[PDB]
A paper describes a structure:
Several plasma membrane transporters import proline into the cell, including the Sodium/imino-acid transporter 1 (SIT1) encoded by the SLC6A20 gene. As with the homologous ACE2-B0AT1 complex, the structure is a dimer of heterodimers where homodimerization of ACE2 is mediated primarily by its neck domain while the ACE2 and transporter subunits interact via three distinct sets of contacts.
We therefore determined the ACE2-SIT1 structure, with an open-conformation peptidase domain, in the presence of glycine to a resolution of 3.46 Å overall and 3.76 Å for the transporter alone. The maps were sufficiently detailed to model and refine residues 11–582 of SIT1 and 20–768 of ACE2. This movement between open and closed conformations occurs as a 30° rigid-body rotation around a hinge at residues 612-617 in the loop between peptidase and collectrin-like domains. Accordingly, the glycan density is weaker in this conformation as the chain becomes more mobile. Without a secondary amino acid substrate, SIT1 has undergone structural rearrangements that open the transporter’s cytoplasmic gate.
Author numbering:
A (entry chain A): 62 to 399
B (entry chain A): 468 to 738
C (entry chain B): 603 to 738
Write the structure that this text describes.
């Protein structure tokens, strides 16, 4: 896989240099101009060899530091807790203020401090790379994925994204304020004398390590706990729902709205069931568009309602990938990243 | 944002946008946002914002072709071929056309709109508004869990000195922080028999006002996450308040610590 | 002269000597000159340097307690201090500017230790008593 990826990357890089022979100042075909834009972006090839290798080194170092980050007891350095196992459980299940504060502070002091000097250089290197490609800043290069030009009414500038996001967020704020107030009121009864009724929420009491999701706080903020949630996990077991028929149900749901059927080779090449311990495979549900009408799904599907919803989600990606199969390879992607 | 003002800005944005306050103070040596996976691995994060809107813009659109009558959260687009065709008209498009044109083929609009999300969550929004009649909605950017350990100082230069009074610039603040650090050192040396190397960077000051009234708290020498409890700070200030008063030519009334009240002294009596 | 002395240095011409007599100005109730008093004195000197560089040269220089280097501490409380660059120790502020800074803010330094111009001698900075104003 590394050899194949390196060959593909080398081919893409050498074709990027060849694409420079056709400037955008003379291209008049819309799809041709867009493909030229897609293949013309230098990316990290515009920096010097030393700067490029330093950027790759710091990126790899940051990734490794995040991956290997462990919180350890000074008394016994041998025993440590990793991020995914244990620490997430501590942040999502514990009802002790001191324990959650310790987990949050230890994670943000053991990984953040080691990442600050690297991130300082990463910012400068990314800014230099962006400026070498006629961009004001690297964030502008990020926002460039929504850039639309030369359509006479559909045009979208990179600086328009900031103002649009700012305008849209002010219309969510009225709902977010009430949701935050309710969450604070409900947490007042779980962590007394720590949640002020007049102030904000402490960062370590949001059910997750970073507060990106408040899902784990549901148990502490359920509106009516006496009424059970809609669960159909046991019903599927009673009807003996294996991980072969739920995909059929999802396919029927898709075809009910007019979307096409599944490919003949999709079911044969798929891995809708875990291969057990004999074969080592990944379990993150992913959709794969290999090409030449080859669409596949990787998923260690269990018997769960969440598995059913995830199967629907992955079939959505599969259908989207199948929809634009006739488009040129450079245009075989969504309208934007979202 | 200057390189030496990242965290102070970051926790200034969380306090007024997300409404989340850090439990313990963080200096510039921390990189809290880098603790997130998507920040330390160079992934654009705005994608997760727009995707949150688009789906609802899609869903609210697809329930119009499906002819949904009830609330949006009860809508089902199944068994509706028109909605499927409307979605497929954009799905087959791919990147060949601008994303605005793709949106106009489903939602009929060229720019992203947030109204579908509010329409989806309206049944919850009404209940939440009805559930917060007595509680206080919103948050304040001035409270923090460590604000209970802060000591407020109020200084009146032109009342104790009248004329010939110096101006309270940054140098006077440095001198005041050094005096506080010296007082902490004296308290920890003469009482607890612990040699702690405090400095002018370990007396953190906020909320400076033209009245010369701020809030300072003393942290650990190089462990900013650790804050000295307020009782020990008050004892240290009481122990060496005369030196602090002498350093600024104030006398116990133009330098008020708002919680440390001085003692005048017993009026000794004849037999 | 054969031999050498371990007390001379090319930068010793920029040093300012401070002599302090606690038990003469205060008699009793006099504090002891431990390391905390030295930290306070270095902070006062750094503050004086900041004030001089802000009110005269219009240059914002961030001095600290580590930029006032002190040597030759003795039980008399008589040492030699010199003020260096904020983070460029190889650079030493010339003695004339240090003396001007001390003259500018000597009252604050005296007040910080409850000394008055005679128990805090800078050995090179002599104070001025003040003109005896006369009737017509
Ligand atoms: C800079 O300063 C910061 C502080 O600002 C400092 O960080 C602290 O470091 C200490 C030392 O590591 C941390 O204390 C550790 O906590 C570990 C987590 O497990 C405990 O977490 C809670 C701690 O509460 C303690 O105190 C309360 C009140 O006195 C007491 O009730 C607790 O029992 C505990 O002693 C605690 O709530 C939690 O409770 C468990 O049990 C209850 C049931 O009772 C359950 O309901 C909970 O869900 C939870 O399971 C639990 O007890 C802990 O593992 C650790 O103990 C090990 O290490 C020490 C040595 O470190 C050994 O002596 C010990 O035998 C164990 O092997 C220790 O107690 C503290 O949490 C940090 N605080 C913060 C804010 O970070 C930094 O270290 C400083 N850095 C520098 C460089 O100076
Ligand atoms: C921390 O502080 C330290 C200081 O403590 C500081 O280090 C100093 O940095 C400066 C700037 O780089 C250095 O000055 C450089 O000197 C280079 C060496 O060549 C010269 O060296 C002697 C310098 O004397 C200067 O001043 C005298 C008196 O004013 C004057 O007469 C000289 O002409 C000169 O200006 C000098 O003796 C020497 O003389 C040559 O010529 C005579 C004949 O006249 C001959 O007999 C000698 O043999 C010799 O050949 C020579 O002139 C010099 O190259 C350099 O000049 C270049 O750089 C500057 C910019 O830096 C350009 O403006 C200039 O046009 C040249 O391109 C500059 O003059 C100084 O020596 C350092 N001192 C010490 C002690 O290190 C650190 O930088 C500080 N660090 C931080 C982070 O703040
Ligand atoms: C831009 O170029 C494309 C590619 O040539 C044109 O799309 C068609 O592509 C097929 C397959 O390559 C060709 O056989 C056709 O001749 C192309 N043209 C048509 C009209 O089908 C596309 O039309 C071009 N755009 C413009 C505006 O000319
Ligand atoms: C990419 O880099 C080349 C030189 O390496 C430069 O000529 C070109 O303008 C850059 N940009 C594009 C889009 O090719
Ligand atoms: C899809 O294929 C299955 C068998 O693979 C078939 O039973 C079903 O009828 C097909 N869908 C439609 C709409 O015909
Ligand atoms: C005031 O009283 C307190 C204790 O009651 C004492 O420590 C302090 O020195 C007194 N201050 C005077 C007498 O000036
Ligand atoms: C002493 O005289 C000098 C100048 O001669 C002056 O700056 C200083 O303020 C005087 N000190 C007094 C009058 O106390």
């Amino acid at each position: 896989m590394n050899n194949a990826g390196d060959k593909w990357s080398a081919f893409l890089k050498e074709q990027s240099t060849l694409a420079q022979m056709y400037p955008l100042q003379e291209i008049q075909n819309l799809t041709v101009k867009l493909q030229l834009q897609a293949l013309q972006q230098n990316g990290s090839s515009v920096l010097s060899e030393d700067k490029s290798k330093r950027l790759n080194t710091i990126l790899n170092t940051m990734s490794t530091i995040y991956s290997t980050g462990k919180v350890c007891n000074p008394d016994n350095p041998q025993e440590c807790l990793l991020l995914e196992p244990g620490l997430n459980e501590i942040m999502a299940n514990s009802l002790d203020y001191n324990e959650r504060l310790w987990a949050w502070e230890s994670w943000r002091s053991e990984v953040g401090k080691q990442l600050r000097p690297l991130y300082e250089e990463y910012v400068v290197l990314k800014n230099e790379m962006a400026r070498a490609n006629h961009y004001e800043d690297y964030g502008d290069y990020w926002r460039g994925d929504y850039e639309v030009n030369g359509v006479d009414g559909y045009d979208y500038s990179r600086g328009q994204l900031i103002e649009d996001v700012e305008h849209t967020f002010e219309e969510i704020k009225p709902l977010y304020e009430h949701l935050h107030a309710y969450v604070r009121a409900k947490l007042m009864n779980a962590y007394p004398s720590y949640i002020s009724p007049i102030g904000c929420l402490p960062a370590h009491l949001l059910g997750d390590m970073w507060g990106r999701f408040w899902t784990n706080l549901y148990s502490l903020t359920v509106p009516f706990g006496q009424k059970p949630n809609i669960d159909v996990t046991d019903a599927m077991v009673d009807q003996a729902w294996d991980a072969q028929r739920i995909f059929k149900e999802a396919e029927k749901f898709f075809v009910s709205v007019g979307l096409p059927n599944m490919t003949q080779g999709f079911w044969e090449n798929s891995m809708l069931t875990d291969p057990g311990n004999v074969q080592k495979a990944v379990c993150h549900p992913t959709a794969w568009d290999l090409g030449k009408g080859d669409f596949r799904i990787l998923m260690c599907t269990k018997v769960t309602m969440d598995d059913f919803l995830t199967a629907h989600h992955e079939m959505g990606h599969i259908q989207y990938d199948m929809a634009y199969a006739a488009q040129p390879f450079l245009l075989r992607n969504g309208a934007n990243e979202g | 944002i200057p390189k030496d003002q990242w965290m102070k800005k970051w926790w200034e944005m969380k306090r007024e946008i997300v409404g989340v306050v850090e439990p313990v103070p963080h200096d510039e040596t921390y990189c809290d946002p880098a603790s997130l996976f998507h920040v330390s691995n160079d992934y654009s994060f705005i994608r997760y914002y727009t995707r949150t809107l688009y789906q609802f813009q899609f869903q609210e659109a697809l329930c119009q072709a499906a002819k949904h009558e009830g609330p949006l959260h009860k809508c089902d687009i199944s068994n509706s071929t028109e909605a499927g065709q409307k979605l497929f008209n954009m799905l087959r498009l791919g990147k060949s056309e601008p994303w605005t044109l793709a949106l106009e083929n489903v939602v009929g609009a060229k720019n992203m709109n947030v109204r579908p999300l509010l329409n989806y969550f309206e049944p919850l929004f009404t209940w939440l508004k009805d559930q917060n009649k007595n509680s206080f909605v919103g948050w304040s950017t001035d409270w923090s869990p460590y604000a209970d350990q802060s000591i407020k100082v109020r200084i009146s230069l032109k009342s104790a000195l009248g004329d010939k009074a110096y101006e309270w610039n940054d140098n006077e603040m440095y001198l005041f922080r050094s005096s506080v650090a010296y007082a902490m050192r004296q308290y920890f040396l003469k009482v607890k028999n612990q040699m702690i190397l405090f400095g002018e960077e370990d007396v953190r000051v906020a909320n400076l006002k033209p009245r010369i009234s701020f809030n300072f708290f003393v942290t650990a020498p190089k462990n900013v996450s650790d804050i000295i409890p307020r009782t020990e700070v008050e004892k240290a200030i009481r122990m060496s308040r005369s030196r602090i008063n002498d350093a600024f030519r104030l006398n116990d009334n133009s330098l008020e610590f708002l919680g440390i009240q001085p003692t005048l002294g017993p009026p000794n009596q004849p037999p």
